[PDB]
Specification:
The structure is cut from a larger assembly and holds chains A, B, C, D, E and F. By secondary structure, chain A is an all-alpha fold. Chain A has two helices and no strands. In chain F, the strands form two sheets. Chain F has a five-stranded mixed sheet. In chain F, strands 5-6 form a two-stranded antiparallel sheet. Classes of the chains: A mainly alpha, B little secondary structure, C alpha+beta, D alpha+beta, E alpha/beta, F alpha+beta. Chains C and D meet through strand 7 of C and strand 2, helix 1, strand 6 and strand 7 of D. Chain B binds three RNA strands through helix 1 and helix 2. Chain E: One of its GO terms (biological process) is translation.
RNA sequence: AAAAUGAAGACAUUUUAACGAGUAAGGAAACGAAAUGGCGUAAGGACAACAAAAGUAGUAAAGAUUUAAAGUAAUUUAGAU
RNA sequence: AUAAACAUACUUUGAAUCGGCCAAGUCUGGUAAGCAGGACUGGCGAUGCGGGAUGAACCGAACGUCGAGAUAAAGUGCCAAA
RNA sequence: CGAGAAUAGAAACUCUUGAAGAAGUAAAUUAUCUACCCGUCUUGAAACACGGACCAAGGAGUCUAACAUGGAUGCGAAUGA
């Protein structure tokens, strides 16, 4: 019925399918980038907590 | 083929105050009294026949067999529903003797008409 | 419980305006009422002869007939559940020219002024003017900027109680 | 409870259209906040909503909701005698949190419902400026007490049973 | 529940030919099918007037048809009512169509050269209605109308049903 | 024969494109003017809303004679009946006299859509026919240049030049039930009640009522 | 209520929509798209096996006691004694 | 501005009724009354249902026969659904 | 990536019980919920207001005369006779 009532629903649903993948890529991209910074942040401890305990 | 005969109420609408007194019969008569417990529809006693109880139009006046009722008095009445043996079922009247019944019952077999009184006034 | 007098309950309804006693004006007896005008009835207790009924004081009516010394005025009176037509004959001293159509009669002039130009612009070929916009209730105001150069602020908070004695 | 920042101006003959009425209102939502703000103008500056416009209405989140501060609340409430002023001290991590305490204790100790209290000003005071007899004992550095006559804490509502097995004891905790 | 101004009751407009006149039950069937299909306002007008009671189908005397069709030479007067005779004034030549022609009105119209159509012949001849002059006779001439109201009134009295000690 | 159905759909697609431009282009200019006013140190005065959606809250028993007439002129003749009302100096005053029986705010485009798509209806030939196509909307509202359902939703939202003609044609929506209040419906929403103006907090109540 | 169809189908037709509480009181009979729909008692004029023996009844009437079915209901029909 | 085609205007004939009672961000006589008498409005009368344990009027809400769901007054120790 | 459009594509199933009584209905008893005495005067009665012990039969807007409004009918300056 949505297609019958609103024929634009096929165009607007296609965009919402593609935008859905865009946000997933945006999430995965910053996930690795922020994980790297978190990984580097971890290896600033394990050095600066061995230059206080000794 | 038979549509499900659905009933919205399978009980009897007994008259108010007919379970105490004997002069008041069990045939429905709507109370007109001012302080009546029933015409005001008090809770617990609020049972009156209202047109909403009416059964479905398609299956109204239909016997449980799926066929409407058609009463016949003689063998010549059977011919009135010999074309509609799938819609009407003969029912020999209660005054027809035990000799004319075997004429109607046998003829209803020839025209293939269901008879609801096939075991009535038997020997 | 009140009475059935003609002019009952008229201690403050017929009392003259403060410092308004004595004679009426001279434009009261000089205004020209023509048939079809909207006039307001206002009982004048200084002139008793022909005083209209106290139930018509302040009602607005239409002049239907202008007689040599009195002005016919017709008003609608309410009865049990129906509205009837009352046809009085009030002297000019007891009625006042109503300006109920003061606003309306100035809208007609504005439209008539425009329509006069449209019969000249059309004859000479110029694009004719558009009619005045209709009246609408106070519409929701739109969004408007506010400069930050001529602004000032005043903090608003509930006030500490100060005793009145 | 939430805190809002609301400003509005008056546009008519009585007031100049260059004065902005700021406010920091505390209300459960933003429609009970405007109601407090509009009636604060009308009862104080003769400004009616029909002759004014709302310019800004934003929430004010707490900047550091991880630090404990001693809040001081100046308020006025109406009693069956007259109208008084109170100044209560509260310890909480948010301005919107210390006000919520003010409504609960006032509605309990003084039995005055929340539509009688006008919050005037809420500020933060120092460690030694707490006049409350009970609040003064917990502001020190070396405060310690044993939480005694405890009751055993269940993980969630799932493990709570109507009838138990064995004897029940409290905890030194 | 819902708050309505007034509840739905029967609309006080008739839609069938009343009584048991098996010939009036046919014209309504005939004109109730010509109005629906052609959708011509003349047929709706004719159907509507065939379903009115007797007191609302007043007679049209032949001298009314004469003075109404003076300036309509080739036209077919259509009056849904009885057509009586005005024995005081002459009847010119004209084609009429009514529910019932009085004996002397039928003989007078056809004597001068006219025609007396029924309502079946009119639908066959002019179904949508092309050269018809719709007519309906006066309704306030009834004597019962005079007595309506209160006689004592000051503007328009009634006529005081006669009885005992009348004067 | 039926080759005009193919061409009709293209016009509806064209109108949906243009209709979404007005809504999106007017939304961008509001946000763009909000950024420029923050940078320059100026202040911004948001425009007043143009549409009010009112819901009947109470029943029909015990209504004063004048308030009873105002609700009829608003077409709120039943409980849980929501309509779209133009906002000006008159209807705002009318909606204030009947406050204990209405709760009203302002609808977002996501709320106008749900009401018209799910609970939409039209009065054709005097029958409240639910919306099931665009040929039904075009036949009833062709002369008002409203031939689809995204032309009906747009006109209601922006209050166009043909809003009154569209608004009366739509029948008053029949809505479900949902928790109206925190305390009860005998006090104003300001005091945590049920009635009164809810501004943009009416969309929360309409979400559970549709 | 509005559309559609309409010489006889049938269930007082088909489709869509709105509606349905109520004491006093009103809505007589007929009216094909019916200007409310029906049940019951008694009596009178007709109709009741249409190929010249034409409703039922000594192969058991009316009535009475029950059992089942139809109708929302007034009530009807049928089985057994 | 908003609502209005089963809209609007009615016409004829006629039945019942004119013992009323209650509520109040109202009034008069009275010390006062479940007293007497009023103005605007809603109800009981003519009215059931969910709630106030029971209650003609209070609060919700007005009813064809039902099924499923969110609700209103109001509640969630047991009787008692939470 | 892809709306319209042009062209090609795909849906007929399984198990259990029932003339050893399936489904439905009815009667009696139990179990949770629900249920004050009918008629009438009355603002208000279940009322500590009046009639009512039970059953059967009978039992109360009818007839004539005059006027009027309306629905159906005949004729119509005539109608009735």
């Amino acid at each position: 019925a949505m297609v019958k009532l609103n024929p634009y629903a096929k165009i607007a649903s296609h965009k919402l399918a593609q935008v859905a993948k865009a946000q997933a890529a945006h999430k995965a991209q910053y996930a690795a980038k922020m994980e790297k910074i978190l990984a580097a942040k971890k290896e600033a401890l394990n050095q600066s907590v061995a230059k206080r305990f000794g | 083929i038979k549509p499900k005969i659905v009933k919205k109420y399978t009980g009897h609408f007994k008259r108010f105050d007919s379970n105490r007194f004997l002069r008041v019969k069990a045939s429905w008569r709507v109370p007109r009294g001012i302080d009546n417990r029933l015409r005001r529809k008090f809770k617990g006693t609020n049972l009156l026949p209202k047109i909403g109880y009416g059964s479905a139009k398609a299956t109204r006046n239909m016997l449980p067999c799926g066929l409407y009722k058609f009463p016949v008095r003689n063998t010549t009445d059977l011919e009135m529903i010999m074309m509609q043996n799938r819609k009407y079922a003969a029912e020999i009247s209660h005054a027809v003797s035990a000799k004319k019944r075997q004429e109607i019952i046998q003829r209803a077999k020839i025209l293939n008409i269901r008879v609801l009184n096939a075991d009535a006034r038997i020997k | 419980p009140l009475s059935n007098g003609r002019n009952r309950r008229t201690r403050k309804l017929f009392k003259r305006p403060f410092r308004g006693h004595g004679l009426s004006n001279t434009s009261t007896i000089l205004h020209t009422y023509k048939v079809g005008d909207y006039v307001t009835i206002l009982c004048n207790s200084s002139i008793q002869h022909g005083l209209p009924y106290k139930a018509f004081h302040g009602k607005t009516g239409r002049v239907w007939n202008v007689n040599p010394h009195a002005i016919g005025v017709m008003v609608n009176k309410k009865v049990n559940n129906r509205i009837v037509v009352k046809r009085l004959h009030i002297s000019p001293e007891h009625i006042k020219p109503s300006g109920c159509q003061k606003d309306f009669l100035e809208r007609k002039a504005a439209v008539a002024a425009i329509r006069k130009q449209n019969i000249q612009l059309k004859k000479e070929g110029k694009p004719l003017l558009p009619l005045p916009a209709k009246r609408l209730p106070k519409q929701p105001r739109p969004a408007e900027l506010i400069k930050g150069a001529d602004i000032k602020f005043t903090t608003v908070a509930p006030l500490k109680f100060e005793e009145l004695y | 409870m939430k805190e809002y920042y609301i400003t509005a101006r008056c546009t008519d003959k009585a007031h100049n259209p260059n004065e902005i009425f700021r406010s920091r209102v505390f209300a459960p939502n933003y429609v009970v906040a405007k109601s407090k703000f509009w009636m604060m103008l009308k009862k104080q500056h003769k400004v009616k909503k029909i002759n004014a416009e709302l310019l800004q209405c934003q929430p004010i989140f707490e900047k550091n909701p991880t630090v404990v501060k001693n809040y001081q609340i100046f308020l006025r409430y109406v009693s069956a005698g007259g109208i008084h002023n109170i100044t209560k001290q509260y310890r909480d991590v948010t301005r919107v949190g210390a006000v919520r305490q003010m409504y609960n204790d006032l509605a309990s100790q003084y039995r005055t419902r929340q539509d009688k209290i006008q919050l005037i000003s809420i500020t933060t005071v120092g460690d030694k400026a707490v006049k409350n007899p009970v609040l003064h004992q917990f502001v020190g550095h070396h405060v310690k007490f044993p939480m005694v006559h405890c009751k055993p804490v269940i993980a969630s509502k799932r493990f709570n049973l109507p009838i138990k097995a064995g004897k029940l004891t409290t905890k030194l905790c | 529940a819902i708050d309505l101004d007034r509840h739905h009751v029967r609309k006080h407009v008739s839609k069938t030919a009343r009584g048991n006149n098996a010939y009036m039950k046919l014209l309504v069937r005939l004109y109730g099918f010509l109005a629906r299909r052609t959708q011509s306002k003349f047929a709706k007008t004719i159907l509507h007037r065939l379903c009115l009671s007797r007191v609302n189908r007043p007679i049209v005397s032949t001298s009314k048809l004469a003075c109404l069709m003076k300036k309509h030479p080739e036209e077919t007067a259509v009056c849904v009512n009885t057509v009586t005779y005005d024995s005081r004034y002459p009847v010119p030549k004209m084609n009429v169509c009514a529910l019932k022609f009085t004996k002397t009105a039928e003989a007078a119209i056809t004597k001068a050269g006219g025609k007396c159509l029924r309502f079946d012949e009119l639908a066959l001849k002019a179904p949508t209605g092309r050269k018809t002059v719709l007519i309906r006779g006066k309704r306030n001439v009834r004597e019962a109308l005079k007595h309506f109201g209160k006689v004592c009134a000051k503007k328009n009295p009634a006529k005081q049903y006669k009885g005992k000690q009348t004067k | 024969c039926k080759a005009r159905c193919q061409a009709f759909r293209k016009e509806v697609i064209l109108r949906t494109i243009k209709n979404h431009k007005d809504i999106e282009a007017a939304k961008k200019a509001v946000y763009t003017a909000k950024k420029n006013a923050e940078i320059n140190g100026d202040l911004y005065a948001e425009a007043d809303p143009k549409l009010i959606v009112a819901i009947r809250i109470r029943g029909i028993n015990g209504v004063s004679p004048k308030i009873k007439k105002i609700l009829k002129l608003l077409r709120l003749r039943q409980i849980n009946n929501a309509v779209f009302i133009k906002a000006n100096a008159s209807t705002i005053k009318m909606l204030r006299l009947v406050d204990p029986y209405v709760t009203y705010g302002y609808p977002t485009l996501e709320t106008v859509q749900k009401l018209i798509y799910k609970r939409g209806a039209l009065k054709i030939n005097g029958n409240r026919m639910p919306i099931t196509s665009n040929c039904m909307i075009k036949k009833a509202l062709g002369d008002k240049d409203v031939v689809c359902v995204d032309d009906l939703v747009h006109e209601i939202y922006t209050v166009g030049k043909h809003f009154k003609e569209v608004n009366n044609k739509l029948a008053p929506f029949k809505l479900n039930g949902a928790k109206i209040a925190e305390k009860n419906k005998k006090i104003h929403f300001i005091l945590g009640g049920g009635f009164g103006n809810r501004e943009l907090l009416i969309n929360k109540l309409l979400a559970n009522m549709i």
